[PDB]
Amino acid sequence: MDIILGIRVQDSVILASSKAVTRGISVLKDSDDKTRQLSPHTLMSFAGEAGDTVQFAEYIQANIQLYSIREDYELSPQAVSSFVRQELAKSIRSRRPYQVNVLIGGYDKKKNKPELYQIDYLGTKVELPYGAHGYSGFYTFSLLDHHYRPDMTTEEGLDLLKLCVQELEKRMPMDFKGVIVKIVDKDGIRQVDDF
């Protein structure tokens, strides 16, 4: 798929992801949710080749959910992100690699800190205050470099995110049909229904 954004603020992580799905010259759907909840306080958005994205995401989801049941304990965002990276680094030298880029947004309940990890299909992991995959960063990073502070509120994070989406909507040739925004904080994961 196309655009996935992420921003880590004071007390939460905000993930924005496009709604469009295209087959050939036709847009089949304009309300697609490009994300999976891995655990109550960990969310993963994804973008890449058709089919591979969902299969990989659901496979990761199943593994983390299995771990949670076995240990009766939630893995830290850092631990999950490392597991995901290894699966992708393992994948890149396979017969047919999984062509998926992900953002992992989580709230670490132990450290009481939000955390954002950006991982590409090669298995290249980086912790960031804000991130993106594909061409999304080319348009948005200049705004984020300028406006981002680490002490921002969730509301300020959403306003800065609106500015990023507006810039994308102005300068991108592709119509990505807006974004679904989700917030990850101490209380868990919730969706912003009006954006």
Partner: peptide, 13 residues
């Protein structure tokens, strides 16, 4: 228990 837990996630998947 381990086998059951694996099958449970496998069914959901």
């Amino acid at each position: 228990i381990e086998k059951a837990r694996v099958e449970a996630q496998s069914h959901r998947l």
